[PDB]
Amino acid sequence: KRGILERLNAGEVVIGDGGFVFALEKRGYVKAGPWTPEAAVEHPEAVRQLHREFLRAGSNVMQTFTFYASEDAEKISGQKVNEAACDIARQVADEGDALVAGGVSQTPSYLSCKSETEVKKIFHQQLEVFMKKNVDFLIAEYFEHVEEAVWAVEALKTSGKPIAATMCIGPEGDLHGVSPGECAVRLVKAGAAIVGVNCHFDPSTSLQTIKLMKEGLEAARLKAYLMSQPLAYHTPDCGKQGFIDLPEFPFGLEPRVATRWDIQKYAREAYNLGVRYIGGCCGFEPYHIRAIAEELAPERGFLPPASEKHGSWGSGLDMHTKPWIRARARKEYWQNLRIASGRPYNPSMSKPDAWGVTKGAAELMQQKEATTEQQLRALF
Amino acid sequence: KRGILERLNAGEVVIGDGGFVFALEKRGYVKAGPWTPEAAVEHPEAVRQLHREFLRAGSNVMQTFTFYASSGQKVNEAACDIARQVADEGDALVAGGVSQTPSYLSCKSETEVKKIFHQQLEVFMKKNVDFLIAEYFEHVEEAVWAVEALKTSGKPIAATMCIGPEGDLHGVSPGECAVRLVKAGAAIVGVNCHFDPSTSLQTIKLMKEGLEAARLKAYLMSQPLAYHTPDCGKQGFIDLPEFPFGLEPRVATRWDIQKYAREAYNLGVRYIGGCCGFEPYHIRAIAEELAPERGFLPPASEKHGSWGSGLDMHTKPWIRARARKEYWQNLRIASGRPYNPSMSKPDAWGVTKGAAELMQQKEATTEQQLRALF
Amino acid sequence: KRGILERLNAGEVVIGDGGFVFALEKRGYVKAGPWTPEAAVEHPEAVRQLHREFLRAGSNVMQTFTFYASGQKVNEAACDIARQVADEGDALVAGGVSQTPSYLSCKSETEVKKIFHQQLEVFMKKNVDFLIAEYFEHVEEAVWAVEALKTSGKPIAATMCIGPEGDLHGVSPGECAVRLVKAGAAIVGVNCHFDPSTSLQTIKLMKEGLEAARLKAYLMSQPLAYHTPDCGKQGFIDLPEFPFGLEPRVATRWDIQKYAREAYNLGVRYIGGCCGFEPYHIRAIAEELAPERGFLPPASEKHGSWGSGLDMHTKPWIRARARKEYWQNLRIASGRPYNPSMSKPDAWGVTKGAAELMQQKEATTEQQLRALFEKQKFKS
Amino acid sequence: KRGILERLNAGEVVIGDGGFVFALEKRGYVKAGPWTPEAAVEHPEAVRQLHREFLRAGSNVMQTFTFYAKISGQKVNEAACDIARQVADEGDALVAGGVSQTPSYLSCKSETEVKKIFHQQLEVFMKKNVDFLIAEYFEHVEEAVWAVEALKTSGKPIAATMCIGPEGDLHGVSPGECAVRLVKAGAAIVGVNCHFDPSTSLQTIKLMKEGLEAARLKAYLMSQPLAYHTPDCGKQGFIDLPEFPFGLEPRVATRWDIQKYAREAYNLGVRYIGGCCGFEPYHIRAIAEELAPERGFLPPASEKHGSWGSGLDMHTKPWIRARARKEYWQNLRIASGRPYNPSMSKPDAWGVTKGAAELMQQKEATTEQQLRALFEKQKFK
Numbered sequence A: 001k002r003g004i005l006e007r008l009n010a011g012e013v014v015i016g017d018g019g020f021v022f023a024l025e026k027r028g029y030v031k032a033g034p035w036t037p038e039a040a041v042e043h044p045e046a047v048r049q050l051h052r053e054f055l056r057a058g059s060n061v062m063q064t065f066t067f068y069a070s071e072d073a074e075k076i077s078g079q080k081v082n083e084a085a086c087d088i089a090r091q092v093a094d095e096g097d098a099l100v101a102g103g104v105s106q107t108p109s110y111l112s113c114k115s116e117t118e119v120k121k122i123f124h125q126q127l128e129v130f131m132k133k134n135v136d137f138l139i140a141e142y143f144e145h146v147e148e149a150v151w152a153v154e155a156l157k158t159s160g161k162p163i164a165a166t167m168c169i170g171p172e173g174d175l176h177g178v179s180p181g182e183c184a185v186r187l188v189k190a191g192a193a194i195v196g197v198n199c200h201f202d203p204s205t206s207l208q209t210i211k212l213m214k215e216g217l218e219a220a221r222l223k224a225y226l227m228s229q230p231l232a233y234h235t236p237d238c239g240k241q242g243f244i245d246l247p248e249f250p251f252g253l254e255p256r257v258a259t260r261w262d263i264q265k266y267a268r269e270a271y272n273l274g275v276r277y278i279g280g281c282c283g284f285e286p287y288h289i290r291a292i293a294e295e296l297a298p299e300r301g302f303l304p305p306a307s308e309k310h311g312s313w314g315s316g317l318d319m320h321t322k323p324w325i326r327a328r329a330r331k332e333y334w335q336n337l338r339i340a341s342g343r344p345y346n347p348s349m350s351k352p353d354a355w356g357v358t359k360g361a362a363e364l365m366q367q368k369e370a371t372t373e374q375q376l377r378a379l380f
Numbered sequence B: 001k002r003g004i005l006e007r008l009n010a011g012e013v014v015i016g017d018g019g020f021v022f023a024l025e026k027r028g029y030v031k032a033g034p035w036t037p038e039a040a041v042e043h044p045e046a047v048r049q050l051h052r053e054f055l056r057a058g059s060n061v062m063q064t065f066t067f068y069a070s071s072g073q074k075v076n077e078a079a080c081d082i083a084r085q086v087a088d089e090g091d092a093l094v095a096g097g098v099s100q101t102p103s104y105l106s107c108k109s110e111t112e113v114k115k116i117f118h119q120q121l122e123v124f125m126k127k128n129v130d131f132l133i134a135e136y137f138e139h140v141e142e143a144v145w146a147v148e149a150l151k152t153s154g155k156p157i158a159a160t161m162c163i164g165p166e167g168d169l170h171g172v173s174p175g176e177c178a179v180r181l182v183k184a185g186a187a188i189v190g191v192n193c194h195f196d197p198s199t200s201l202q203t204i205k206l207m208k209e210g211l212e213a214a215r216l217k218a219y220l221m222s223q224p225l226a227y228h229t230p231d232c233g234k235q236g237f238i239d240l241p242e243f244p245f246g247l248e249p250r251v252a253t254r255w256d257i258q259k260y261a262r263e264a265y266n267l268g269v270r271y272i273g274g275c276c277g278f279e280p281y282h283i284r285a286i287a288e289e290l291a292p293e294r295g296f297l298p299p300a301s302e303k304h305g306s307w308g309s310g311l312d313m314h315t316k317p318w319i320r321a322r323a324r325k326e327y328w329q330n331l332r333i334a335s336g337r338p339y340n341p342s343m344s345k346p347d348a349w350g351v352t353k354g355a356a357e358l359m360q361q362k363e364a365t366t367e368q369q370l371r372a373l374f
Numbered sequence C: 001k002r003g004i005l006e007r008l009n010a011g012e013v014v015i016g017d018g019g020f021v022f023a024l025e026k027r028g029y030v031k032a033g034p035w036t037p038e039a040a041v042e043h044p045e046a047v048r049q050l051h052r053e054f055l056r057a058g059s060n061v062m063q064t065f066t067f068y069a070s071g072q073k074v075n076e077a078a079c080d081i082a083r084q085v086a087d088e089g090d091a092l093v094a095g096g097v098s099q100t101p102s103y104l105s106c107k108s109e110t111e112v113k114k115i116f117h118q119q120l121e122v123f124m125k126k127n128v129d130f131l132i133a134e135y136f137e138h139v140e141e142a143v144w145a146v147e148a149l150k151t152s153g154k155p156i157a158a159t160m161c162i163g164p165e166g167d168l169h170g171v172s173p174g175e176c177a178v179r180l181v182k183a184g185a186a187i188v189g190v191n192c193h194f195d196p197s198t199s200l201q202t203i204k205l206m207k208e209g210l211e212a213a214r215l216k217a218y219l220m221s222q223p224l225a226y227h228t229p230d231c232g233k234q235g236f237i238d239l240p241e242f243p244f245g246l247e248p249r250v251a252t253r254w255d256i257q258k259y260a261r262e263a264y265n266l267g268v269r270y271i272g273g274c275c276g277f278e279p280y281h282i283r284a285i286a287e288e289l290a291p292e293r294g295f296l297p298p299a300s301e302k303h304g305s306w307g308s309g310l311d312m313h314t315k316p317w318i319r320a321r322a323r324k325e326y327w328q329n330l331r332i333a334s335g336r337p338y339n340p341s342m343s344k345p346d347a348w349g350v351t352k353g354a355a356e357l358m359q360q361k362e363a364t365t366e367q368q369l370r371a372l373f374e375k376q377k378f379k380s
Numbered sequence D: 001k002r003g004i005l006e007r008l009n010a011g012e013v014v015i016g017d018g019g020f021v022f023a024l025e026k027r028g029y030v031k032a033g034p035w036t037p038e039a040a041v042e043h044p045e046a047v048r049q050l051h052r053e054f055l056r057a058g059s060n061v062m063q064t065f066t067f068y069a070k071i072s073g074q075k076v077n078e079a080a081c082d083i084a085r086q087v088a089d090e091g092d093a094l095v096a097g098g099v100s101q102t103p104s105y106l107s108c109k110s111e112t113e114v115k116k117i118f119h120q121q122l123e124v125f126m127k128k129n130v131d132f133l134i135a136e137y138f139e140h141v142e143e144a145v146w147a148v149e150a151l152k153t154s155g156k157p158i159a160a161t162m163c164i165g166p167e168g169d170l171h172g173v174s175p176g177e178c179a180v181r182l183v184k185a186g187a188a189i190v191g192v193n194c195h196f197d198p199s200t201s202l203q204t205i206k207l208m209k210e211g212l213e214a215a216r217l218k219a220y221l222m223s224q225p226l227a228y229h230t231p232d233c234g235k236q237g238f239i240d241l242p243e244f245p246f247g248l249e250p251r252v253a254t255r256w257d258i259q260k261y262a263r264e265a266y267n268l269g270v271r272y273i274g275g276c277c278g279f280e281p282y283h284i285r286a287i288a289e290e291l292a293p294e295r296g297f298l299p300p301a302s303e304k305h306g307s308w309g310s311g312l313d314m315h316t317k318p319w320i321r322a323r324a325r326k327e328y329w330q331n332l333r334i335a336s337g338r339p340y341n342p343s344m345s346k347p348d349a350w351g352v353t354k355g356a357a358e359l360m361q362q363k364e365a366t367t368e369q370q371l372r373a374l375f376e377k378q379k380f381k
Ligand SMILES: [Zn+2]
Pocket: A019, A199, A200, A281, A282
């Protein structure tokens, strides 16, 4: 039916899908650590059910549950995985008003300062499969260096398919110091029709960057579509690198998970800021996606199927012998309720793990500190 | 092959399943408010996938995704079937359940109310369920009736309740409950839902006591909330302001569950599961913690590790340094919401009669008299 | 003028003084650990100024800044300073005695009782307005103190730093009050080791015990000004933050007013404070019960009702704070987002040896666990 | 005998005094109304005891408990300076006269008029022989610069500090620029004070330090921050915070907090380290003890103290004795004791409007209704 660029050009709002990888980990099919997708062949019914839950939630994009392979004889079964995945994706995408998207991300074999040629071959190696499976469009995501991302877009444009590029960096800028605005520019110039940011930072942060990007493009005449797919984790204490530096990553993030109301707020802000491809990254479960779609329903003209088992703002609580519980079926109540953590012995924030060791500072100052205390004790 | 009572008698640890209803709500198949299971026929593949995820997590019980019908009967049947199918795929049994009824509260008489339990029992009889479970009771009075009604089947009966350490809505302490419940024929007794892990085990101790101080003997069962509810006044987390759309933050971590599972086991509980909030990985936490004792790891552990182990690898040193039990067992995880409190006062309405009001007048007057002195 | 018993019998509300010892520690005249009063002779002007600040705050009692000892000169210099300030206003002087190792390593009833008499002497020689056997946990001993003090024929008020649970020997609050009044205490209550809210829970119990025994007496409370919801059983002393990191738990004037109101409504007629109570805290008690007492303490001269002094102020939002409703309901912030709101007490609950046998079973479980993963994962 | 500039030039560390006004408010001598010093004559013994507690704590400066106004106020000011001088004389300390942001400027009252004020106050300070002058509380370099200028008239050393963080001053006059302009205007000592907790306060200093360095101008660094943790200071000082000024209790710093700050301050180059609102005597004592090794002595107040909980060595309880360690107190995340309260609060300021505010609610209201609409339609299918 309608392609990515068409939808956007028609003024439509493209609902993205959520955090596939994390959802499967909690369901028992993906192992935190390597975070690989071999379940697409080991447990297809699981991968399928998830894609369907997102589709039901209103998601318009089924991102392939793929991964870069080549892992060694000297080749890969990982390729069968990737293909099985694209297929499952396509199957579910076909079941609804959705497209399939192939993705590629930050290459370790780059952070070894290899070369644009070598690294770029990777992106092409993956592009192949996406070509063969005839994906609807491509997405370069999970990037902290425009430098590289720019390469990906370039490598992908080869396909002649629409290209979307988000980055996993917030406020400040990328790792080399490049500000968000510059990024967007460079990225669109490199051919990205859709640009934005994904994962690494929570909803609020993520939209701060978008504004900046938005700015950069405006102050350069370049025009493109805005995209955001943030964490569903509240990360106000995120110092840098993303929530990965947070002590709780990735087994104690439970409490930071956003509520449906949190997501609606974000979706509203996003839309009002101009973002038109609104999705989510790690942490986004099906109901989170459903929150985006319900919040913008008035604008889109419809409710996703999943809303069948839902209500406006607690409405399904109209009924219920208890008055105080029925009194919660109101937008005003949920939109303002400061929910409790349930953990009075825990802080509300944590210092990142950064350990970008200054150096002997973790020695000298420490030593100097130790000595100062003793000299001090002496004067006593 | 092995039945519920056999497993327990063999010294085995029966891993229960989790919070089916809540999980489907987040997945988009159960509407909050009515909380009904019509998806067993509208979207069987969904119900099936969940039962399988729990089974994969190490769960030994597939509780029927049934309910009480005013058809809804086809629903119930379709559910039991799906349950049985998945149960058959692994080392698990199917269990039929019944709970508190609106009619009890509409003081409807032991006869009338008891008919309900029998109406549901029928289906469970017809779909050869391995055993029965009377859960979700705030009044032993009624629960006792359920057990009685169910014993009719001659199948093993487990009765859990949602009551804190202070007894039920009739003042009956936990110990008394357990007694009355086992005397009524429950071979397995314990507490389910309405109270987080820690609390839930406080009651068990009490129940344990009551049975011990009465010579009655039975098997202990617990299936708590996966929600930290230290601010729960009384009448479960349902009275909490955040119920049921803002509980996110209180969700337990796998480490929280392991701790609980360990305490539970050490306290003597042998049927350890979970209620609302329990997702597949939570069940997997129970099974992994007691793996040494049980002799095996559930399949789901294939995509897991001991205590963060899968983090051994990872170019980052500080992240690799997290692959340790000591690290996760002691880490005080942050809420990520610095503008929110860590606790909330329940909603549970008590007064507005004489009090309440004056809890406004005398205060108003005091302020004025005070202002006067100035 | 009016004696202790008279005041109470006239229906009057006796405002107690605050946490002398802690206030002088923060001012630099008392050292924590020994917490002795040798400043009464080393820096009398300091001790004097404090007694005066409380007196100005509305306090009706100047408790001697005495100790257990030259230490005797100290004690005498203290009583004198007390008397001098007490004389400057509508206040009485009170001599106190508390739980000391005479009972610790168990020095009988004879030996221990001699102590109380040794201190009583000085109090007799200064003709204090009344006696207070405070800071107690074992009624057993407290009962001895009251007995030893009755010897003086002066009124005896009694207070124990104990919870809604019961004395250290295990006897419930009600029993305590009974035993204490029977032993001759005309005034009974609890002081220290627990925050406002808790402290009043016990009073209710005590109140009960006396009522359910026909015994009649006056109720007294002098709690901590520290919020201690996480207090386990042996006072805030077992709390990790004792005594150098209690800052955040300090009560606000509004907190104190609330307490004073509850206390009064419950029947307490001798309302004061212990550790943590600064002058303005005392002033909060007196202002809250002002309507009832008929007057405001002098210190109110530099104060206002409920933020009233904020009427003025070019800023509207700041002027909008000059209201009881605003301060009585404002959930003040901690300002420490990286800190928990509660802490587990320290009291090694004698596991002994298990504190080292359980920590074994855990170690072993982890290894056995690690073992299973090794086997099962290395074979599909 | 040693003057302010001498001390600093000798490499010495000048310990400032604390939050006099707030301390007297809690003690019952300063009304939270307009915060005036009439107690210097109504209750001298109180003012005296405080100055002495700071002096005992190691403070080297007794700032006059003065105030800008006929109102029986000049006698007040004089009585204050005297009390100050008396206590200053009792130890190794100097007296300092201060002036701050005044209502004039905020009503736009010509540099001439406003400047007269500073001179009116200067007079008294001249007459009582204050050792040096201080321009604290300044939210506009523009004005502060005027103060310094007005004060240089005295030929006495001039110290500058302001209540405005890294964002810079109201006029977008970044911290660096401020320091520059301030020293150029004659300030020998520059820094920040009031309305920014320890951590923040030192962030600005670094900036100022920078500005001066990148301009060859040289001067002495000074900081006297709040003893209140204000991570939520949305913008304006803690005055915009909901809890100001009667619910700040919980944010109060601990002695350990202060030591940390004092250490950072010193390491950053600050040599005049004091405190503003919230600083009690023991807070000052924390600064002095932390830098004791460097200074060569402990203030008298340390007589009733210990290194890091040392006084806990004794105590029948093992777990309590185990707390007599720097490592324990320096790392202990102290609890708030208020599980029903948040750890942060949004400041009070106000986005005027007439647009999407009287409307934010409108579009929101309408969206909810349209949303509600869609729900009815589909549950009919
Ligand atoms: Zn992600």
